[PDB]
């Protein structure tokens, strides 16, 4: 098998960049497209499809597109390929999960509040100048906007996409380093089984593949994946399962690497659930946080491969501070947890069951069982785990709001910015706000951080904003990741990126 075999999972949603907010779809999307910038293994952006990106003020942007780029259907990548895709993502009528990434652009409010009788379908701040040039006017200085231009929300789309976006999402056509295979025995995307990609011969950008293709195998169980790794039937496994964390070093030797990654994990309890809204719900979320022993779970369940949360972002990000005032809400304190739960009971006495739903295909069983048992023992309530088989179905129930319990969540960074760990999850309208948290004061504080002229002041304002999150506990931050990645004896040049994923394009296979 010339192709590199790596682990993945069925995407919950069609393969439309602005419609993808999860890592299963994301790891495919990022192989199929090339954006204005591309990111290296440490998350630094470089010009890719853009010939230049100019802004002196973080408000006005002039973007020129390199000539000669095309999609795999032969059509050219133009300024329109970007502007039309961004307007599609921003328009509320299209219900794109990545809509919030367009929020800084002037005119976003015309298209995003709702479908509306607004009569406007495009953003006034986004203006084509010529076939290979467009300008962007932001509502306010936005410190991360340039950095974000390597993210999938901003990928260009071919003209055909807009005539039938459902068809596009089933069979995407991109401009990136790989393309969907022309499989010799069935479709490239075998739903719930695998996706096969081959190099795109048109592509001459910054991420040229060093291998002959990629096969993302959609494992139902990470123990199966680990067994395949040890037998050489899998080439790269980006998540060693809990059952192997005390053993992977002896099993794999120098074919496994570990390190902090900008990924976190949270316990999400929708504010719409019984006993979990209003001030009552805030007190109960604070109680849950005090009822969980993060150091102990990190040591025993994860064998030291998770680090207890100290904020709502991740230890490895620029500006992170593990000693923020008020972060004591993230310390284990059973007496405090019981006091807070009782104070919530003063509003309305608790009744029923507290269930933590999770996707069993990614090794969460041990920690969810431990957290549920900790809550049960500290607070004296009926707390249980509620496994579901697949990430795709689990996320679908979270997104459509069918899910009727608490559930695990967590963010893998898209670019290295604390703001990017907060805006998609906790601002009022964000598509990845799974719990219905709304606090206009937090959104305002975060906007102030985005408007800072320097990264230093911006980081200070981000952490100021996180004081509100310590008070509201919109979700319960658990820990951030020490990624552990293993690979077979048939591949080399395996680098783990800043956000825990293999650097797929650069893997080599003899």
């Amino acid at each position: 098998p010339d192709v590199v075999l790596v682990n993945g999972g069925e995407p919950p949603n069609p393969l439309i960049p602005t419609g993808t907010n999860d890592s299963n779809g994301g790891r495919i999307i990022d192989r199929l497209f090339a954006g204005l910038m591309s990111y290296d293994a440490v998350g630094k952006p470089s010009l890719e499809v853009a010939q230049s990106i100019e802004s002196a003020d973080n408000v006005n942007y002039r973007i020129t597109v390199k000539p000669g780029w095309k999609f795999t259907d032969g059509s050219p990548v133009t300024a329109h390929s970007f502007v039309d895709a961004w307007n599609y993502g921003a328009l509320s009528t299209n219900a794109q999960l990545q809509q919030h990434f367009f929020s800084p652009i002037e005119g976003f409010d015309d298209v995003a509040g709702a479908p509306g009788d607004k009569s406007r379908t495009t953003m006034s701040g986004l203006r084509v100048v010529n076939d290979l040039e467009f300008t962007v006017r932001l509502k306010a200085p936005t410190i991360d906007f340039t950095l974000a231009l390597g993210h999938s929300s901003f990928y260009p789309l071919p003209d055909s996409a807009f005539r039938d976006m459902a068809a596009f999402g089933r069979n995407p056509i991109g401009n990136g380093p790989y393309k969907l295979a022309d499989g010799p025995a069935g479709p490239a995307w075998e739903h719930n089984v695998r996706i096969d990609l081959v190099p795109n011969p048109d592509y001459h950008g910054n991420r040229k593949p060093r291998n002959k293709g990629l096969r993302f195998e959609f494992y139902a169980n990470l123990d199966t994946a680990y067994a395949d790794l040890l037998s050489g039937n899998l080439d790269v496994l980006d998540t060693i399962p809990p059952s192997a964390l005390t053993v992977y070093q002896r099993d794999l030797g120098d074919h496994a690497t570990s390190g902090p990654a900008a990924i976190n994990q949270t316990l999400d309890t929708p504010l719409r659930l019984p006993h979990f809204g209003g001030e009552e719900g805030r007190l109960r979320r604070l109680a849950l946080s005090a009822a969980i022993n993060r150091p102990q779970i990190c040591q025993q369940i994860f064998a030291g491969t998770r680090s207890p949360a100290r904020d709502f972002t991740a230890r490895s990000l620029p500006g992170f501070d593990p000693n923020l005032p008020g972060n004591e809400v993230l310390d284990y304190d059973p007496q405090r947890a019981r006091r807070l739960w009782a104070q919530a009971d003063a509003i309305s006495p608790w009744s029923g069951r507290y269930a933590i739903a999770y996707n069993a295909d990614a090794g969460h069983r041990d920690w969810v069982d431990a957290v549920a048992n900790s809550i049960k023992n500290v607070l004296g309530i009926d707390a249980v785990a509620a496994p579901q088989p697949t990430f795709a179905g689990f996320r679908t129930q979270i997104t459509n709001r069918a899910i009727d319990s608490a559930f695990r969540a967590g963010w893998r960074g898209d670019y290295p910015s604390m703001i990017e760990f907060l805006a998609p999850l906790f601002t009022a309208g964000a598509g990845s706000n799974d719990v219905g948290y709304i606090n206009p004061e937090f959104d305002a504080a975060l906007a102030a951080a985005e408007a800072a002229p320097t990264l230093t002041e911006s980081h200070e304002l981000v952490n100021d904003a996180q004081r509100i999150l310590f008070h509201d506990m919109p979700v319960v931050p658990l820990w951030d990741y020490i990624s552990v990645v293993g690979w077979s004896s048939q591949v080399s040049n395996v680098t783990v990126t800043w956000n825990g994923l293999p650097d797929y394009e650069n893997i080599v296979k003899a």
């Binding site: 890592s23 994990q265 990614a362 990430f391 996320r395 898209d414």
Partner: peptide
């Protein structure tokens, strides 16, 4: 992205 939301993580598996």
């Amino acid at each position: 992205v939301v993580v598996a």
